[PDB]
Design a protein around this ligand. Sequence first.
Ligand SMILES: [Cl-]
Ligand SMILES: [Cl-]
Ligand SMILES: [Cl-]
Ligand SMILES: [Cl-]
Ligand SMILES: [Cl-]
Ligand SMILES: [Cl-]
Ligand SMILES: [Cl-]
Ligand SMILES: [Cl-]
Ligand SMILES: [Cl-]
Ligand SMILES: [Cl-]
Ligand SMILES: [Cl-]
Ligand SMILES: [Cl-]
Ligand SMILES: [Cl-]
Ligand SMILES: [Pb+2]
Ligand SMILES: [Pb+2]
Ligand SMILES: [Pb+2]
Ligand SMILES: [Pb+2]
Ligand SMILES: [Pb+2]
Ligand SMILES: [Pb+2]
Ligand SMILES: [Pb+2]
Length: 136
Amino acid sequence: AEAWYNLGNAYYKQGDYDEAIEYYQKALELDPRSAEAWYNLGNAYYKQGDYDEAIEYYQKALELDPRSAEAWYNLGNAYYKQGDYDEAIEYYQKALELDPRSAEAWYNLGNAYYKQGDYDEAIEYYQKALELDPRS
Ligand SMILES: [Cl-]
Ligand SMILES: [Cl-]
Ligand SMILES: [Cl-]
Ligand SMILES: [Cl-]
Ligand SMILES: [Cl-]
Ligand SMILES: [Cl-]
Ligand SMILES: [Cl-]
Ligand SMILES: [Cl-]
Ligand SMILES: [Cl-]
Ligand SMILES: [Cl-]
Ligand SMILES: [Cl-]
Ligand SMILES: [Cl-]
Ligand SMILES: [Cl-]
Ligand SMILES: [Pb+2]
Ligand SMILES: [Pb+2]
Ligand SMILES: [Pb+2]
Ligand SMILES: [Pb+2]
Ligand SMILES: [Pb+2]
Ligand SMILES: [Pb+2]
Ligand SMILES: [Pb+2]
C-alpha cells in the first residue's frame, strides 16, 4: 500500500490530481487503515473541485484520527467552496480548538463569518490571524 501511496503523493505534488486519485485508491484497496491516505485522497478531489468527494474522504480520515486539525480545516474548506459557510464555521472551529497557531485557519474562519454578513465575528478572527501574521 505504501509504494502505491507514495506514487499517488508524487503525482499530487506535481499537480496531476486524476493520477493521484487512481494510485491513492489502489493504496486504500490494500490498506484502508491510514488516515493520511483518506485525507490526501480528499485533497486530490478538492484540488479537482470535486467537493462532495473531498467531503466523503475527509470524513473517513477524521473517523480514524479526529485529533487532525488539518483534516477538520480541509473539511471546512470543502464546505466554504460549496458556499456552506455554516458548516465551514463549524469545522474551522474544531480545527482551531486542536491547533490555534494557524493565522491561515483564523483568517478563513473570519472569511466564513464575513460571507454570512457577521462582520463583528469576522473582525474577531481577522484580528487573531493578523496578531499571528501581520504581513498579508
Ligand atoms: Cl493530469
Ligand atoms: Cl484524465
Ligand atoms: Cl488518468
Ligand atoms: Cl486514463
Ligand atoms: Cl462534483
Ligand atoms: Cl462524485
Ligand atoms: Cl460517491
Ligand atoms: Cl451548497
Ligand atoms: Cl459559492
Ligand atoms: Cl449543505
Ligand atoms: Cl451565524
Ligand atoms: Cl452574528
Ligand atoms: Cl446574525
Ligand atoms: Pb493525467
Ligand atoms: Pb462529484
Ligand atoms: Pb465516492
Ligand atoms: Pb449546501
Ligand atoms: Pb448561520
Ligand atoms: Pb454578530
Ligand atoms: Pb449570524
